[PDB]
Structure 1
Amino acid sequence: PMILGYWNVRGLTHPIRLLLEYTDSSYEEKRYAMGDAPDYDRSQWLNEKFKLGLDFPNLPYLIDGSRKITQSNAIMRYLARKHHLCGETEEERIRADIVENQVMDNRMQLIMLCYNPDFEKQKPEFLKTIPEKMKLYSEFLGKRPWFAGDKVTYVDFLAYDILDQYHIFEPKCLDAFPNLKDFLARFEGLKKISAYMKSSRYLSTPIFSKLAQWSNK
Structure 2
Amino acid sequence: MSPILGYWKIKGLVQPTRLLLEYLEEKYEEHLYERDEGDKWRNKKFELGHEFPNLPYYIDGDVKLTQSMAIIRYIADKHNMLGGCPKERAEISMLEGAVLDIRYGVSRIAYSKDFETLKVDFLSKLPEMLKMFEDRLCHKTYLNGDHVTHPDFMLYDALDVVLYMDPMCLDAFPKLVCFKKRIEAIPQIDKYLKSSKYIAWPLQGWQATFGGGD
TM-score, reference length from structure 2: 0.92
- Partner of residue 38, structure 1: none
Question: Match of 1:50, SS?
Answer: coil
Identical-pair percentage: 43
Deviates more, 1:91-100 or 1:50-59: 91-100
Cα displacement string for residues 135-172 of structure 1 (whole angstroms, at most 9, x for unaligned residues): 12212333111112221112211111112211221111
Distance in 2, Cα, partners of 1:95 & 1:212: 33
Distance in 2, Cα, partners of 1:92 & 1:188: 25
For structure 1, the 5+ residue unaligned runs are: 36-40
4+ residue stretches of structure 1 with deviation over 3 A?
A: 88-92
- Partner of residue 33, structure 1: 34
Equivalent residue runs for 1:82-97 within 5 Å? 82-97=78-93
Of the three residues 124, 129, 133, the one matched with 2:125 is 129
- Corresponding position: 1:78 with 2:74: yes
For structure 2, the 5+ residue unaligned runs are: none
- Cα offset, 1:88, TM superposition: 3.3
Contact 1:2 1:26 in 2 (8 A): yes
- Corresponding position: 1:185 with 2:185: no
- Partner of residue 134, structure 2: 138
Contact 2:102 2:126 in 1 (8 A): no
Equivalent residue runs for 1:187-202 within 5 Å? 187-202=183-198
- Corresponding position: 1:173 with 2:169: yes
Contact 1:95 1:147 in 2 (8 A): no
- Partner of residue 18, structure 2: 17
Question: Match of 1:29, SS?
Answer: strand
Distance in 1, Cα, partners of 2:186 & 2:57: 25
- Cα offset, 1:24, TM superposition: 0.9
Contact 1:16 1:76 in 2 (8 A): yes
Contact 1:34 1:44 in 2 (8 A): no
Cα displacement string for residues 81-133 of structure 1 (whole angstroms, at most 9, x for unaligned residues): 11222233544433211011122222221012211111223322322222222
Distance in 2, Cα, partners of 1:179 & 1:89: 28
Distance in 1, Cα, partners of 2:206 & 2:15: 18
Equivalent residue runs for 1:106-117 within 5 Å? 106-117=102-113
Closer, same or farther in 2 for the Cα pair 1:167/1:30, shift >3 Å? same
